[PDB]
């Protein structure tokens, strides 16, 4: 049994992959909807990797998920075969 607290972005993991894992685990978490909102508002940025965390903090709390994805595109990457 996993916990949302256990979900952290990998050192080179694409932000898009991490958000998907965060979402899947949060859906299964046993907590109120109000708490799930708070977990998303705080833990998603807090448990991002250092390079994405910097970017997300700069964007600020008004940013949309789509905007966060665009800002973190290619961080850790670009993940093409050599």
């Amino acid at each position: 049994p996993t916990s949302i607290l256990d979900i952290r972005q990998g050192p080179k993991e694409p932000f898009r992959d991490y958000v998907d894992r965060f979402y899947k685990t949060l859906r299964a978490e046993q907590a109120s909807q109000e708490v799930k909102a708070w977990m998303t508002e705080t833990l998603l940025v807090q448990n991002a990797n250092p390079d994405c965390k910097t970017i997300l903090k700069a964007l600020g709390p008004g940013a949309t998920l789509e905007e966060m994805m665009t800002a973190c595109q290619g961080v850790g990457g670009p993940g093409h075969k050599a």
């Binding site: 998907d20 949060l26 998303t40 998603l44 949309t64 998920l65």
Partner: peptide, 12 residues
């Protein structure tokens, strides 16, 4: 962002 934002993004 909120949990509802994740639901919208990956859902309905």
């Amino acid at each position: 962002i909120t949990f509802e934002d994740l639901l919208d993004y990956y859902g309905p």
